[PDB]
Design a binder for this molecule. Structure first.
Ligand SMILES: *CC(=O)NCC1CCN(S(=O)(=O)c2ccc(Cl)c(F)c2)CC1
Ligand SMILES: *CC(=O)NCC1CCN(S(=O)(=O)c2ccc(Cl)c(F)c2)CC1
Ligand SMILES: [Cl-]
Ligand SMILES: [Cl-]
Ligand SMILES: [Cl-]
Ligand SMILES: [Cl-]
Ligand SMILES: [Mg+2]
Ligand SMILES: [Mg+2]
Ligand SMILES: [Mg+2]
Ligand SMILES: [Mg+2]
Ligand SMILES: [Mg+2]
Ligand SMILES: [Mg+2]
Ligand SMILES: [Mg+2]
Ligand SMILES: [Mg+2]
Lengths: 10, 229, 229, 10
């Protein structure tokens, strides 16, 4: 399981 | 360029249609044409550019990861390596396109918000190149990513409140860099922790028009810290 | 062609890698190169070809439908129409590519299974062209779709048991043609009903290596009948 | 809601 980066929103 | 004959406003409108249609390559092309008109981007437009290219490159990264995993499991015919190299080259071409727009058009001057966002974007797409890089290149790309992130960090701590979503998203991605690319888990963990703690200490600075974004990133920082401890 | 220098077996292997990576345009390109070697396709290879192009064209159809709906809601600037026409042209180019492979290479001679599958595929991609067609064209494409489906139906009823998944999938898609394209809901409903009833009457003909596919289509026939009644 | 056609499997 990899680290979470900033996701896409809006 | 292919978008050279189209009005900037029409390019923005079509990017929004392409997002609704989930045509993210089209959306990225429209947003590239809009950038190449040479005017600054608003916050809304920066989001379109960001969403478009992150979708394009995210699908490439996920494909690269599937093929790379098959490739390594088969090291325990040339077709897997060849096809992995083909996806890799496409990914690098997208990252080169984004980095070129940043350096040619976007990074200047301007909003502290906007300056931080473009430097964070530069860090991200160098990081994506670093995920698939080797050798004399890889060290070059890693320092490039760090330098972009570190400049963005300095500006953000100077000019933005600790709950600002660009500030938080940057700090989140910089810590992922430390953990996954630079192999500095202590650096990643200490950055994630102080970022989250400082946002809670100054929770009152949440903005009415972006607080859902801020609290999403704070939770992602906490998820990474649980994963890393 | 772009795949002309690559061994047929390598093209098949890479199509399978592209499916695993969810790179369906790549997968379709590899399968096109394999078809152009001029040998017949096995059942497994026909499935790769089918999955690849259906994924490519499905994303185009879904995008076309979003934009077309926006276009009609705005009839109660040229950008929506222009962008819809751009997606439309791409979709038609994919359907033309598939129909060309069918006519140039695939439809012959051969398995009853394979002959029915390619004629059903021809019906499907004419149907996709009919979804976006108008005028003097549209009538041409609709009769082309019907003729392909009807020939496939005749062969399938002659040569395959009523639970065969190609037979069922063809009958399912032919009824969707009747309902959605030819505006013949009674034709669609009577075909769906007799197809399902005849599969249940001869349920014992389910095949060990395909019964899950058969029973999936039988349920889809029943879902369409509930929707249509 | 549109009619369902044959899906992709395997
Ligand atoms: C005003 C402005 O510049 N808007 C553009 C946004 C700024 C934030 N970034 S981000 O990638 O840092 C980000 C993305 C999602 C979420 Cl939930 C964030 F909190 C930050 C995107 C572009
Ligand atoms: C042996 C062979 O020709 N295999 C290729 C398959 C045959 C069936 N088609 S289909 O599109 O008719 C179909 C797809 C999914 C399901 Cl669950 C079906 F029952 C039929 C695909 C290619
Ligand atoms: Cl390749
Ligand atoms: Cl400073
Ligand atoms: Cl357009
Ligand atoms: Cl007959
Ligand atoms: Mg302009
Ligand atoms: Mg081995
Ligand atoms: Mg390489
Ligand atoms: Mg100004
Ligand atoms: Mg060959
Ligand atoms: Mg109006
Ligand atoms: Mg037209
Ligand atoms: Mg033979």
């Amino acid at each position: 399981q990899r680290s979470t980066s900033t996701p896409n929103v809006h | 360029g292919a978008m050279g004959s189209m009005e900037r406003a029409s390019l923005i409108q079509k990017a929004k249609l392409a997002e609704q249609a989930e045509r993210y390559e089209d959306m990225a092309a429209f947003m590239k044409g809009a950038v190449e008109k040479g005017e600054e981007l608003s916050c809304e437009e920066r989001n379109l550019l960001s969403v478009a290219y992150k979708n394009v490159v995210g699908g490439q990264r996920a494909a690269w990861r599937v093929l790379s995993s098959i490739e390594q499991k088969s090291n325990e015919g040339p077709e897997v390596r060849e096809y992995r190299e083909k996806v890799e080259t496409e990914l690098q071409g997208v990252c080169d396109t984004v980095l070129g727009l940043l350096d040619s058009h976007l990074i200047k001057a301007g909003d502290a918000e906007s300056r931080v966002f473009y430097l964070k974007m530069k860090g991200d797409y160098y990081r994506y190149l670093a995920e698939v890089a080797t050798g004399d290149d890889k060290k070059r790309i890693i320092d490039s990513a760090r330098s972009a992130y570190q400049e963005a960090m300095d500006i953000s701590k100077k000019e933005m409140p600790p709950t600002n979503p660009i500030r938080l998203g940057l700090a989140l991605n910089f810590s992922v860099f430390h953990y996954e690319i630079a192999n500095s888990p202590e650096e990643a963990i200490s950055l994630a922790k102080t970022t989250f703690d400082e946002a809670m200490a100054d929770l009152h600075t949440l903005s009415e028009d972006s607080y859902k974004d801020s609290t999403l990133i704070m939770q992602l920082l906490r998820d990474n810290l649980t994963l890393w401890t």
